[PDB]
Amino acid sequence: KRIKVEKPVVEMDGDEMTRIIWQFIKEKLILPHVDVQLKYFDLGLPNRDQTNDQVTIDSALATQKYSVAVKCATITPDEARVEEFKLKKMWKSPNGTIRNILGGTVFREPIICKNIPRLVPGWTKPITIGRHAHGDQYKATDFVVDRAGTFKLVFTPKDGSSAKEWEVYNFPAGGVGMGMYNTDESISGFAHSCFQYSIQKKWPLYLSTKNTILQAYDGRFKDIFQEIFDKHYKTDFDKNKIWYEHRLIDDMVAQVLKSSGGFVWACKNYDGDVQSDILAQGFGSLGLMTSVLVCPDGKTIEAEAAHGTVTRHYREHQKGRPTSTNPIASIFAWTRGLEHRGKLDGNQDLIRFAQTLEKVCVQTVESGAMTKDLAGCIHGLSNVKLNEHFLNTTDFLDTIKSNLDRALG
Amino acid sequence: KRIKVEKPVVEMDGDEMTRIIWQFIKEKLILPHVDVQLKYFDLGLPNRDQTNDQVTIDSALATQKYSVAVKCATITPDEARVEEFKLKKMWKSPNGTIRNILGGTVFREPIICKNIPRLVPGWTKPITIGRHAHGDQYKATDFVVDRAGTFKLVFTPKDGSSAKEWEVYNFPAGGVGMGMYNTDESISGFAHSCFQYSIQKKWPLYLSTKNTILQAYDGRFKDIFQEIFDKHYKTDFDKNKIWYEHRLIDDMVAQVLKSSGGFVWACKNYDGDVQSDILAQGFGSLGLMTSVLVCPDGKTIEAEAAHGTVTRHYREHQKGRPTSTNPIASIFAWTRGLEHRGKLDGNQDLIRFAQTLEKVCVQTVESGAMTKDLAGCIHGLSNVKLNEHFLNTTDFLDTIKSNLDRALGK
Ligand SMILES: [Mg+2]
Ligand SMILES: [Mg+2]
């Protein structure tokens, strides 16, 4: 019997090869077991252009309403994509837009498969990055200086007090300038979520900044975290034999590499983007990773596939040929979506299905049935072969489907 | 008989554990075998405070004059350091101030010992990071927003063109803002350095940015590198079977961790700081890495230890507790300083001494005498033990001192 879900799930469609596997996953794994009401938004690049990127804002507003989104990987366009898709604007990142509106922390962690070898031998336990999802480089204003001139910052107070101007630089010739920001509210919510997840895991927490160089900007991150820790969380950290410490970013990453894992890592928005990929790759593969935005309100989430759209595999699919594409991150976006939908509704049957599918995915890879990229981690890309070391995208999903049916019975 | 050194070498002194190691090296390893005139500048935090940070500017000026600096790792103040040292102001990064005056690229690579298992087993060849030494976070203007108000950017052209304003954010409550920049001239020189270094090494080059998010700012880096590649280097890269590619920083770092090395990695100022510590640590230790600021003119350099002051080892050493800090990167700052001084003057004995001291360091570790960090790579950090697997800071330095005297004795 299919599990009845009462409240809706927001579904965000994607691009190229991820768009196609997103549909297979829905057909083969999700819908045959779950009767769920889907609130569809096409964040494919053609439709984002068609709606002047308004579909992206509505998908986020819908997520605030219904409290659970699941997202397919999308194209953030450059010059090349603007020419290829004939876009009228170089539209901003859908991910950055959705994260800004919703706010909160993007938690990312590996999907550990026993047989997929780590590139960092020392990491015996997993690590979780809490990436702050708001502000900084993902809400910056930047520009090209094409001639001599003065660049300055200006802060005009609301209360009526005098404006403060800072002369940033008197450009003699061309260059670039940018401004970015963040709020106390956004940093406080970011801190709270990280402290709570650390208690939940029984793991210590590390904040990373460069407050020696950005003494006001990064110092505020250090100050707010240490304030919230002292007043709200120090007692709960002591009871669980865990701690909190601020580290300089360059010191942190070395320490992380030397570690054995088993900690939470609060990263700034930019650092989260960079270091989550070092984490994913170090644990075995970029495709073996979850990514879940947890909003400040505690109720709303957005689960996503954090990787790209796999353009090379898509081109082959256009020419009627078979591909071998890892669907696990996309699968885990659905399960994390459905699990939280089940938590809010009090639907234990749904929660159990999501966890069962996550386990079946790992077991299928651990049994030796896998896609080309994962088989390449084991035997090397030069030594792998079809129906010997790896399977087609749909065949792997069909293997996952068979194992999912056996587990449920 | 000391080696006479005709011309001076600028010396920048530092803080905490590196300051103590710096003085051992100067006193006991360098000037008993090298008659060298040192233009001494104390960039220890108390003297920077004493001089209103002018000594930092004066050290940078002196490096331009004599073309060679050797620097000890320094403290950059935050709020805690103002309390600690009772500072007049929250002074800026002296490395920032030095790098901004001198300009150039900071080249960073591992110091390889056959004896030391990597944390990243895949990296069978070394990797060099060309770090851009100018602009971005290290020249930024940042501030605390402590009341409601609007933050904007304003560009006013010098020759009468229309001025442009951009609203960054309307703050309802408290927060933070910042503005930063870089220049076409600085980024072009950064490209030239990295392309030239790549052709020397016969290695491919990668530039990392986030041009998909920072369309203008990071796009400018991508465009200038590509123009300069096609105008000056593309032919030579193709002839030498090497290549240049741009990659998104997040894509790049994953590629690095999975690679087997053998490439140059052009990093922006911020990225180069973070990624150079990943690199040193992955090859074995923060103590086994060189760092050289190569200026545009092709003559001036500043050699340093990439790693910090080792504050956590300094707190133990202050209270008399056991300590084992790796001095090799700090020694290699002296040797690359002297080697370059020797190369400029045509002083062959001074070049040989520098290289002899580098061989002594590597052969000392390769013979089984080492500091804790390196012992941990072999035996595991949770099983190493004082005087069984590793030596003290002083006992390891005395071992370098003993082996050095024996080396040039032979
Ligand atoms: Mg990323
Ligand atoms: Mg550093």
Side-chain angles (χ1 to χ4, degrees), chain A, chain B residues 1-152 154-410:
Chain A
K1 186 181 76 66
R2 300 175 66 191
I3 297 158
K4 176 64 188 183
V5 189
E6 79 193 335
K7 301 211 198 313
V9 176
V10 173
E11 192 206 322
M12 299 157 165
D13 213 341
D15 284 296
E16 301 184 332
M17 198 67 217
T18 34
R19 186 183 186 83
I20 303 308
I21 66 154
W22 187 264
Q23 191 55 222
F24 288 134
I25 291 156
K26 206 198 295 188
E27 289 168 7
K28 295 176 178 294
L29 307 174
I30 306 301
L31 296 171
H33 293 105
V34 190
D35 187 347
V36 64
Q37 197 184 152
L38 296 168
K39 293 285 172 188
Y40 180 78
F41 295 87
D42 190 0
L43 311 191
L45 185 52
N47 191 63
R48 282 184 279 145
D49 191 73
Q50 184 166 349
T51 60
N52 306 310
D53 204 46
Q54 183 58 49
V55 68
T56 305
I57 293 175
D58 297 357
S59 70
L61 291 173
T63 309
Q64 260 155 7
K65 191 180 171 188
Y66 302 114
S67 312
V68 186
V70 295
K71 177 165 184 302
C72 187
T74 51
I75 300 164
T76 298
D78 51 17
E79 288 179 65
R81 297 299 198 176
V82 167
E83 296 189 45
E84 192 203 341
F85 284 85
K86 288 293 202 276
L87 304 176
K88 75 197 79 154
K89 301 277 169 58
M90 194 186 301
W91 300 109
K92 273 159 272 193
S93 164
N95 302 305
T97 300
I98 293 159
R99 289 168 193 159
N100 183 64
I101 294 159
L102 299 174
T105 312
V106 178
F107 292 89
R108 282 172 186 187
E109 49 178 31
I111 293 159
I112 304 296
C113 301
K114 278 282 293 306
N115 62 336
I116 302 304
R118 297 189 256 85
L119 291 173
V120 180
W123 299 344
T124 55
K125 299 173 289 308
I127 304 158
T128 298
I129 294 179
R131 170 180 174 191
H132 190 201
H134 172 269
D136 302 2
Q137 286 89 346
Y138 289 83
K139 251 290 213 153
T141 306
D142 59 330
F143 56 93
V144 174
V145 178
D146 75 320
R147 63 185 81 234
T150 306
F151 173 34
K152 45 156 180 167
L153 296 162
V154 182
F155 184 79
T156 303
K158 232 189 216 81
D159 64 1
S161 310
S162 62
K164 193 118 75 174
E165 301 188 352
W166 301 266
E167 186 167 313
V168 174
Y169 188 59
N170 179 232
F171 285 86
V176 286
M178 73 185 282
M180 35 163 260
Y181 71 95
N182 221 314
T183 59
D184 288 2
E185 171 151 59
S186 185
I187 296 165
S188 305
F190 168 47
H192 278 291
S193 299
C194 289
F195 288 124
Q196 286 162 191
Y197 186 97
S198 292
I199 289 158
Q200 216 77 345
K201 285 305 208 83
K202 306 267 266 294
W203 283 355
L205 180 63
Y206 298 91
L207 173 67
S208 175
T209 78
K210 193 80 200 201
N211 74 312
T212 46
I213 304 303
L214 297 189
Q215 299 175 307
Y217 202 105
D218 282 16
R220 196 101 194 82
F221 281 85
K222 186 181 185 189
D223 289 0
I224 290 174
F225 268 67
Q226 194 65 79
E227 282 165 13
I228 291 166
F229 181 72
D230 286 163
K231 196 161 76 169
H232 296 295
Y233 297 106
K234 200 218 166 186
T235 306
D236 266 37
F237 268 60
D238 293 1
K239 188 203 172 186
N240 294 250
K241 288 174 155 176
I242 55 165
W243 57 91
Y244 164 70
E245 266 178 0
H246 170 267
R247 293 280 171 75
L248 291 169
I249 177 60
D250 60 345
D251 179 54
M252 181 58 185
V253 295
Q255 209 70 240
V256 170
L257 197 67
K258 195 168 65 178
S259 189
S260 62
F263 58 93
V264 187
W265 181 11
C267 289
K268 287 181 68 186
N269 200 347
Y270 181 74
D271 292 331
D273 187 30
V274 177
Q275 301 305 135
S276 59
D277 286 30
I278 303 199
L279 228 73
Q281 185 59 91
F283 279 109
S285 174
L286 284 166
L288 295 172
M289 204 199 215
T290 64
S291 184
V292 180
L293 182 74
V294 182
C295 301
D297 62 6
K299 200 185 181 179
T300 309
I301 70 160
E302 179 224 13
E304 77 188 332
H307 59 69
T309 59
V310 199
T311 308
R312 298 146 309 287
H313 296 197
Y314 179 65
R315 293 281 175 266
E316 298 298 297
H317 198 90
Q318 293 175 252
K319 323 209 185 204
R321 295 163 202 172
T323 61
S324 184
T325 317
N326 189 3
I328 295 166
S330 304
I331 292 163
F332 271 59
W334 279 99
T335 57
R336 291 289 151 103
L338 295 172
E339 187 181 307
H340 188 80
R341 183 72 282 169
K343 280 179 186 167
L344 296 171
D345 299 346
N347 191 332
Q348 308 308 324
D349 290 325
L350 183 55
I351 292 161
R352 192 178 308 104
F353 170 78
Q355 305 279 22
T356 302
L357 178 52
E358 287 185 353
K359 191 65 170 59
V360 166
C361 292
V362 172
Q363 287 174 299
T364 306
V365 177
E366 287 175 354
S367 77
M370 65 194 78
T371 44
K372 200 168 201 273
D373 64 323
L374 298 187
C377 299
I378 299 185
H379 313 271
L381 281 304
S382 61
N383 317 322
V384 285
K385 280 165 167 49
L386 186 72
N387 291 297
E388 188 181 294
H389 306 284
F390 70 95
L391 300 170
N392 284 339
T393 312
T394 51
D395 289 13
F396 179 64
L397 292 168
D398 289 345
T399 313
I400 289 171
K401 198 189 89 70
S402 296
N403 298 168
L404 182 64
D405 295 327
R406 175 157 79 257
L408 289 167
Chain B
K1 193 89 184 197
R2 292 179 292 173
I3 298 158
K4 66 217 171 191
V5 189
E6 56 273 292
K7 285 187 177 166
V9 177
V10 169
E11 193 204 321
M12 294 153 175
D13 211 343
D15 300 283
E16 300 178 333
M17 196 73 267
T18 50
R19 193 192 178 77
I20 289 164
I21 290 156
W22 197 254
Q23 199 275 337
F24 193 105
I25 295 154
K26 197 204 319 199
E27 196 194 347
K28 309 178 188 179
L29 307 179
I30 301 300
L31 57 63
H33 308 122
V34 188
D35 190 4
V36 61
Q37 169 169 18
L38 305 175
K39 300 295 177 178
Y40 180 75
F41 295 86
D42 189 355
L43 302 202
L45 185 51
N47 192 53
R48 278 180 284 151
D49 192 63
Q50 173 69 27
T51 60
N52 307 308
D53 208 47
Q54 183 63 44
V55 67
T56 307
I57 297 166
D58 298 353
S59 67
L61 291 169
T63 309
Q64 292 182 327
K65 188 164 166 60
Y66 308 113
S67 18
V68 191
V70 292
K71 181 163 184 295
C72 184
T74 48
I75 296 164
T76 301
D78 61 5
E79 293 78 44
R81 300 297 197 177
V82 170
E83 271 223 62
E84 267 206 64
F85 291 82
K86 313 213 201 312
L87 303 175
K88 298 143 158 189
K89 306 249 184 160
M90 201 183 298
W91 308 111
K92 303 157 280 160
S93 171
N95 298 314
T97 310
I98 290 156
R99 290 161 188 163
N100 187 64
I101 297 161
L102 303 182
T105 299
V106 183
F107 293 101
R108 296 191 164 173
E109 64 183 82
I111 299 164
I112 294 285
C113 306
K114 287 201 303 309
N115 204 13
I116 308 298
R118 293 153 268 154
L119 295 184
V120 188
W123 297 344
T124 51
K125 286 167 158 50
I127 297 163
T128 304
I129 280 159
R131 172 187 176 181
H132 191 198
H134 172 268
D136 301 355
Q137 285 79 348
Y138 293 83
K139 256 307 213 217
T141 301
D142 61 328
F143 52 89
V144 175
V145 176
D146 61 12
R147 72 202 74 195
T150 304
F151 170 33
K152 70 159 176 278
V154 187
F155 191 80
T156 307
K158 181 163 144 62
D159 294 293
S161 276
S162 177
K164 289 164 182 187
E165 305 195 349
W166 295 269
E167 185 159 7
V168 181
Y169 187 53
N170 189 344
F171 289 84
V176 285
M178 67 99 84
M180 74 185 211
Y181 71 97
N182 219 320
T183 53
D184 286 2
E185 195 163 277
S186 186
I187 297 158
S188 296
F190 172 46
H192 281 293
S193 310
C194 294
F195 287 121
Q196 286 169 198
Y197 184 85
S198 300
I199 296 159
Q200 186 229 312
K201 297 283 280 169
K202 202 99 169 299
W203 281 354
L205 182 59
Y206 301 99
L207 172 69
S208 50
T209 74
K210 193 81 188 186
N211 78 304
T212 50
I213 302 301
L214 300 184
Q215 296 181 356
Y217 202 98
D218 282 25
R220 195 90 202 92
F221 278 80
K222 183 179 190 299
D223 296 353
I224 287 163
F225 268 71
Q226 187 55 42
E227 292 153 12
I228 290 177
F229 178 63
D230 286 141
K231 204 183 189 206
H232 301 286
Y233 305 110
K234 179 173 148 49
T235 307
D236 292 34
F237 270 64
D238 296 334
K239 180 260 157 178
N240 293 297
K241 321 308 187 195
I242 56 165
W243 53 88
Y244 166 70
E245 274 163 34
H246 175 270
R247 262 141 162 76
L248 296 175
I249 183 66
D250 61 333
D251 299 26
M252 184 67 227
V253 298
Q255 186 188 324
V256 171
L257 200 65
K258 198 181 72 277
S259 75
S260 64
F263 59 85
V264 187
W265 182 8
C267 291
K268 294 165 91 277
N269 200 341
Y270 180 84
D271 290 305
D273 181 47
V274 175
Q275 300 315 128
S276 57
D277 281 10
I278 274 154
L279 214 78
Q281 186 62 84
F283 281 104
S285 171
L286 283 161
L288 297 174
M289 166 159 283
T290 47
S291 184
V292 183
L293 175 57
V294 175
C295 300
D297 63 20
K299 306 206 190 73
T300 306
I301 58 153
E302 181 222 7
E304 70 189 354
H307 65 78
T309 60
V310 203
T311 306
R312 60 220 293 173
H313 292 195
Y314 187 67
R315 301 317 184 195
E316 298 293 347
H317 183 80
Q318 273 188 128
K319 306 186 282 277
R321 286 257 187 250
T323 266
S324 180
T325 307
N326 193 336
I328 291 158
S330 300
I331 296 166
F332 272 64
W334 280 93
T335 61
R336 296 289 155 95
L338 294 174
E339 190 195 330
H340 193 89
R341 178 74 281 161
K343 203 190 288 187
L344 279 167
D345 303 335
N347 195 324
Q348 212 66 229
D349 295 340
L350 200 265
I351 292 167
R352 187 171 274 94
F353 167 81
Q355 291 170 198
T356 301
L357 181 44
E358 290 187 4
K359 257 178 278 297
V360 165
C361 290
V362 174
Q363 290 164 28
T364 297
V365 172
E366 287 168 344
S367 70
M370 63 187 79
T371 47
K372 192 186 168 175
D373 60 321
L374 306 194
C377 297
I378 299 160
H379 306 291
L381 285 156
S382 81
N383 275 248
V384 292
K385 188 172 281 187
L386 177 56
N387 285 306
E388 197 174 314
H389 306 270
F390 62 90
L391 295 172
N392 267 337
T393 306
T394 305
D395 289 349
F396 180 72
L397 278 163
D398 290 326
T399 313
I400 272 66
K401 194 174 66 55
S402 182
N403 297 154
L404 179 50
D405 298 331
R406 195 168 297 117
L408 49 60
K410 293 166 178 169

